[PDB]
Amino acid sequence: LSAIDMYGHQFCIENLQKLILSETSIFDVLPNFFYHSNQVVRMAALEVYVRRAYIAYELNSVQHRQLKDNTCVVEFQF
Amino acid sequence: RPDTMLGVVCGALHVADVSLRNSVSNFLHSLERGQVLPAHTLLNTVDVELIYEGVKYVLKVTRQSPNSYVVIMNGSCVEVDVHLLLSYDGSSYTTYMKEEVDRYRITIGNKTCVFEKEHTGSLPRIKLHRVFHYVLDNLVNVMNGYCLPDPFFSSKVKDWVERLMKTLRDPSLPLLELQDIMTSVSGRIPPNVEKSIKKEMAQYASNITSVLCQFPSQQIANILDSHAATLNRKSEREVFFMNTQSIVQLVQRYRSGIRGHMKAVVMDLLRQYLRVETQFQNGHYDKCVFALREENKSDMNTVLNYIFSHAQVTKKNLLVTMLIDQLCGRDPTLTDELLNILTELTQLSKTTNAKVALRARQVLIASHLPSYELRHNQVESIFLSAIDMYGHQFCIENLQKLILSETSIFDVLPNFFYHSNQVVRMAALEVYVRRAYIAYELNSVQHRQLKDNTCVVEFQFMLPTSHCQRMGGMVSFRTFEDFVRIFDEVMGCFEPIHILNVAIKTDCDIEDDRLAAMFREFTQQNKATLVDHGIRRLTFLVAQFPKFFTFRARDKFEEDRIYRHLEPALAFQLELNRMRNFDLTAIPCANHKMHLYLGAAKVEVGTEVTDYRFFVRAIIRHSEASFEYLQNEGERLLLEAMDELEVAFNNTNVRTDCNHIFLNFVPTVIMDPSKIEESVRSMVMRYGSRLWKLRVLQAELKINIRLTPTGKAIPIRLFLTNESGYYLDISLYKEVTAQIMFQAKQGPLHGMLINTPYVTK
Numbered sequence: 001l002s003a004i005d006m007y008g009h010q011f012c013i014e015n016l017q018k019l020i021l022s023e024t025s026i027f028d029v030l031p032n033f034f035y036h037s038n039q040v041v042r043m044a045a046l047e048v049y050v051r052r053a054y055i056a057y058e059l060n061s062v063q064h065r066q067l068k069d070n071t072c073v074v075e076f077q078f
Numbered sequence: 079r080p081d082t083m084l085g086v087v088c089g090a091l092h093v094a095d096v097s098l099r100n101s102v103s104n105f106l107h108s109l110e111r112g113q114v115l116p117a118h119t120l121l122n123t124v125d126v127e128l129i130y131e132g133v134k135y136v137l138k139v140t141r142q143s144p145n146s147y148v149v150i151m152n153g154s155c156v157e158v159d160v161h162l163l164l165s166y167d168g169s170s171y172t173t174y175m176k177e178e179v180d181r182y183r184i185t186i187g188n189k190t191c192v193f194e195k196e197h198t199g200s201l202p203r204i205k206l207h208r209v210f211h212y213v214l215d216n217l218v219n220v221m222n223g224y225c226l227p228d229p230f231f232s233s234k235v236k237d238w239v240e241r242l243m244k245t246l247r248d249p250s251l252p253l254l255e256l257q258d259i260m261t262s263v264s265g266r267i268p269p270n271v272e273k274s275i276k277k278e279m280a281q282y283a284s285n286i287t288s289v290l291c292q293f294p295s296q297q298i299a300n301i302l303d304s305h306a307a308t309l310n311r312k313s314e315r316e317v318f319f320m321n322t323q324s325i326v327q328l329v330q331r332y333r334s335g336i337r338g339h340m341k342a343v344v345m346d347l348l349r350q351y352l353r354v355e356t357q358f359q360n361g362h363y364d365k366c367v368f369a370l371r372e373e374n375k376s377d378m379n380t381v382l383n384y385i386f387s388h389a390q391v392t393k394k395n396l397l398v399t400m401l402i403d404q405l406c407g408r409d410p411t412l413t414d415e416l417l418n419i420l421t422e423l424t425q426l427s428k429t430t431n432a433k434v435a436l437r438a439r440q441v442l443i444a445s446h447l448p449s450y451e452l453r454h455n456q457v458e459s460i461f462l463s464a465i466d467m468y469g470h471q472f473c474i475e476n477l478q479k480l481i482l483s484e485t486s487i488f489d490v491l492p493n494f495f496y497h498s499n500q501v502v503r504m505a506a507l508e509v510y511v512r513r514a515y516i517a518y519e520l521n522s523v524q525h526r527q528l529k530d531n532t533c534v535v536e537f538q539f540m541l542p543t544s545h546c547q548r549m550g551g552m553v554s555f556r557t558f559e560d561f562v563r564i565f566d567e568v569m570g571c572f573e574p575i576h577i578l579n580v581a582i583k584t585d586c587d588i589e590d591d592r593l594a595a596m597f598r599e600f601t602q603q604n605k606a607t608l609v610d611h612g613i614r615r616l617t618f619l620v621a622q623f624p625k626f627f628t629f630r631a632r633d634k635f636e637e638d639r640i641y642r643h644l645e646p647a648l649a650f651q652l653e654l655n656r657m658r659n660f661d662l663t664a665i666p667c668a669n670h671k672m673h674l675y676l677g678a679a680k681v682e683v684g685t686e687v688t689d690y691r692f693f694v695r696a697i698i699r700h701s702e703a704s705f706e707y708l709q710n711e712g713e714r715l716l717l718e719a720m721d722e723l724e725v726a727f728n729n730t731n732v733r734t735d736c737n738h739i740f741l742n743f744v745p746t747v748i749m750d751p752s753k754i755e756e757s758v759r760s761m762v763m764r765y766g767s768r769l770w771k772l773r774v775l776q777a778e779l780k781i782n783i784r785l786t787p788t789g790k791a792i793p794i795r796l797f798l799t800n801e802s803g804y805y806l807d808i809s810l811y812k813e814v815t816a817q818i819m820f821q822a823k824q825g826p827l828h829g830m831l832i833n834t835p836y837v838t839k
Contacts, residue, residue: 006498008530037468037501069527 006040019048020055027052042072050074079189083201086128086135087156088164089182089193090149092175094124094139095160098147109378114367117385122225128182130193140227143219148227154200155228167203206245207254213238218347223354223387223394235397243404247336252293253282255328263324266317274301275325293332298325340408344401345416351398352423354384355391359428391430399437406441410448417442429768432717439710449701454490461494465505477509481516484745486699488513492624496554496581503533503554511535511552514579517647518542528571532564537577544650548614550577558582558618562600574612574632579645581619590666597627598637617645623670639664644673652695652742656835661687665726669718672696674726676734679838689839690732692772694719695740705747705754708781709761712741716765720772737774738836739798743781746791755808758798762806775800795820795832 003015019026034045043064050062057078065073101121108115128135138150145159158164164171176183182193217238220226245251256279264272278294285291302322309315331339360366370381378385387394423438448456464476480487495510497503504525511523518539526534537550553568555561561582568580586593597618607613618627626645628638641649642664662675672694679689696719700711723737762769777798784791792813797820799807811820818832 039500 001041004040004044010040010044012044016048016051020052039066039072043074046072047074050076054078080184080186080191082130084166085130085184085191085193086137086151087149087158087166088173088175088184088186089128090124090126090137090139091147091158091160092173092184093126093177093182094141094149095147096175097121097124098139098141105379105382109382112371112375114364114371117382117389120382120386123227126195128193128195133197136197138227140225142224142227143216146216150227151200152198153228155230156201156203158203206248206251207258209241210245210251214242214343217242221347221394221397222350222383223390224383225386225390226393231393232396235400239400239404243340246339249286249291249336251336252332253279253286256282259324259328263321266321268305268318268321270305271301271321274298292335293329295329295333298329302326337408340405341413341416344405345419348398348401348419351394352419355388355394355431356426358384358388359426359431388430395430395433399433402434402437402441406444409441409445412445436710436714436717439706440714443703443707443710446703447701449485454493457487457490458494461491461506462497462502465502467499467501467505469501471501471505471508473505473509477512480509480513482746484704485701486744488699489623492581492619492621495552496556496583496621500533507533507535507552507554511537511550514645515539515550515647517651526571528567531560532567534568534571544647548575548577550579552579552581554581556583558584565604569607569610569613572610572613574614576613577615578613579615579617579619581621581624583621585622586620586625594627594637594642598629601629601631601636640673640675642666643670652697652740653833654695656833657693659835659838660689660691660693662693665729667722667725669696669715669722671698671700672715672719672722674719674722676726676730676732677738678732690734692723692726692734692737693740694723694738697742697744699744704745705749705757708743708745708747709757713761713765720768723772735773736776736801737772739774739777739779741777741779741781743779746782746784748784748786751794751810754796755810758808759806762798762800766804770804773802775802 003012004010005012030045030049033041034049036042036045047062047064051059054076059076059078061075061077063075065075067073098121101119105115105120107113108119122140124139126135126137126139128137136152138153140148140150142148142157143159146157147160149156149158158166162173164173172187174185174187176185180195182195184191184193217235220235256275260275260279275298278298282291282293302325306318306322309318331342334341357370358366360369367385370384371378374381420438420442424435426432426435444450464473465471466473480491491506491510491513495503495507497506508523508525512520515537519542520537520539522536522538524536526536528534533552533554535550535552537552538547539550540547551568551572553561555564561580568578572578601607601616607616612632614630614632616629618629619625620627623643626641626643628641628644628646629636630638630646638646640654640662643666657675657677659680660677661680662677665674665676667674673696674692674694677689677691677693678687681687696715698708698711777800778795779798780793780795782791782793795811795813797809797811799809801807809825811822813819813832814821820828820830820832822828
């Protein structure tokens with residue numbers, strides 16, 4: 001929460017590298033917030049989960065959509 | 079041979095220096111002869127006007143500090159110092175002066191230059207240890223009351239004071255002064271005491287920036303104390319004497335900290351000012367000068383610096399307020415010795431010494447309760463904490479504590495409806511809505527949410543007879559530019575029946591003219607707003623009381639002047655229709671609470687206006703204590719207001735006679751009516767001649783008060799009545815129901831309703 005911009009950028013790629021080269025497993029609490037009330041923590045947490053899923057394959061594009069109001073969407077492309 | 083501008087310099091300050099000292103010697107004539115000369119004759123300012131080659135040189139010269147003389151070109155300031163020794167830009171020079179009846183003849187060594195006496199420019203002719211000592215001493219010579227060369231002071235001291243206070247908090251001071259002093263008395267030295275001092279200055283230096291760093295005062299003193307203990311019998315101790323003193327007064331300042339100084343130096347300096355100008359005031363200038371004269375009849379020079387000082391009291395006096403003010407920047411738990419001086423300070427009894435007293439009280443209360451940006455941090459807590467932060471978002475009971483807040487909260491709350499958490503965003507923002515249009519009835523409000531960068535609120539209400547239904551829009555924004563590029567969605571998602579107020583940031587600045595003029599010219603450049611089915615109203619709200627920018631025109635003139643800095647739904651309650659038989663011009667003014675209008679009696683085409691009254695209309699909500707506080711704030715407002723009304727005279731003059739004061743007290747005190755009547759008596763009585771110069775004859779207040787036995791707030795429109803003469807009538811009524819009704823004694827013009835337009839002669 002400290003790291004995240006919480007502007008539209010939400011550019012924590014270096015912190016994302018701490019997430020992806022974490023000795024510590026972060027599937028524990030991360031789920032507790034990727035459904036928090038906070039559009040930013042939603043977006044960030046959810047796509048990092050994607051990335052942590054498909055670390056094996058090559059991801060060439062991922063865009064979040066945000067529809068009607070109550071749905072948070074991430075896009076995969078690989 | 080010489081350089082012209084040097085010529086002007088050495089001219090101006092040679093004639094000056096001679097004249098200034100002579101003026102002193104003229105005083106010494108008068109003082110041996112027991113003559114009470116007017117202060118002015120001591121002649122700081124020396125006005126030399128010297129035309130070389132057609133261009134006149136226009137000058138004044140004011141001695142600024144015992145070393146320092148200031149040459150003033152058309153209100154410029156260049157500072158040199160003397161003893162004949164001259165100090166200039168480059169170096170030290172030698173000048174000789176021949177003066178004539180009407181020519182000014184300067185010889186600079188073997189060289190002569192001659193000027194006849196028969197524009198706009200300034201000269202650029204221009205570490206913490208000396209910046210400190212130097213600047214402090216210069217200001218205390220300034221501020222013992224010498225006088226002042228130009229306007230720049232009210233700025234100059236402000237910068238100066240921050241360098242002092244700031245370099246005085248900086249705990250590298252004792253280091254910089256104990257380095258520099260113990261280096262400059264490095265010899266004559268006993269190494270026990272030298273290895274002690276040099277070690278411990280060095281690890282004050284190493285241990286500075288520690289959380290727990292205090293000066294080792296007791297330690298240095300004790301070492302000195304023990305080997306003074308064994309040098310005591312000796313009586314070969316005058317080297318030791320001048321090191322044990324040079325060390326003991328430096329260490330003596332530093333036991334109680336940087337606020338060892340903030341107490342000591344400023345408190346003393348305060349009593350310096352205090353004592354001087356308190357002995358100064360006991361009756362009137364002449365008689366007081368004879369009592370001053372006679373307490374020290376033989377000499378008058380210390381007194382003359384005193385007399386010289388109270389000529390420019392307000393300079394001293396304002397800056398005294400500055401000093402206390404930033405002291406109160408760090409007061410909140412001060413001390414007995416100080417509060418003692420403060421109760422001494424309240425007794426001060428003269429028109430000139432009128433700020434310090436109000437300062438004494440304002441300090442003593444704001445001491446009891448913070449009301450500035452630090453408590454803006456406290457409100458950060460109250461507001462954000464008070465929010466519920468869910469789809470509930472219910473804080474209606476808290477909204478009534480906002481609406482029954484002793485503290486006025488239209489000030490800081492606007493600063494928060496653009497924070498960064500969308501639910502609390504929503505909550506805080508709608509509470510702002512509710513607090514804007516609480517006057518009319520709101521029957522529907524939907525939060526909107528657009529694209530990503532705009533938060534929109536909707537209003538839904540109707541007209542209670544102001545002049546059927548309408549909606550509204552609020553938007554929270556970061557810069558005006560974005561506002562004009564995010565233009566297209568605000569009217570994108572919008573008889574115009576919409577109210578539109580837009581919140582912007584960027585904290586408007588010096589260019590008020592081009593500022594709002596630009597804003598208005600946003601409307602006239604793009605009437606595109608008009609093309610989108612028209613907008614009833616456009617208020618731009620710029621945050622910091624946020625400065626409002628009222629643009630009323632569905633089909634009207636671009637920009638509204640009576641209500642600038644104000645929102646007209648809540649503003650209407652200043653019953654401003656009670657002067658429709660008048661022509662009033664909104665003048666922008668400090669104390670912006672206080673909107674003062676100059677009134678010309680509105681008449682029909684058949685006739686030309688007969689009345690020309692100054693109106694000053696305020697609004698009151700500045701946060702037993704409250705009632706007295708109310709009075710004190712009123713007094714402060716009165717002095718600023720009379721500054722403003724002075725500007726009003728200068729700007730436009732019509733020589734008003736029966737000036738009006740309109741006061742809307744929005745707090746809710748608990749008090750009795752007749753001690754209120756004595757208190758206001760004491761106020762109005764306390765101020766005498768000043769009232770008669772402006773010849774203010776009419777004052778109106780209202781004030782909601784309550785009584786905690788009922789805990790029930792009633793309004794009491796008190797109207798004040800005073801005519802020619804200092805004879806004063808207080809009119810108290812009651813407000814009775816449906817159009818409210820003044821009902822009492824017997825008072826002339828007893829019983830009428832409230833929206834009574836003002837009688838025109």
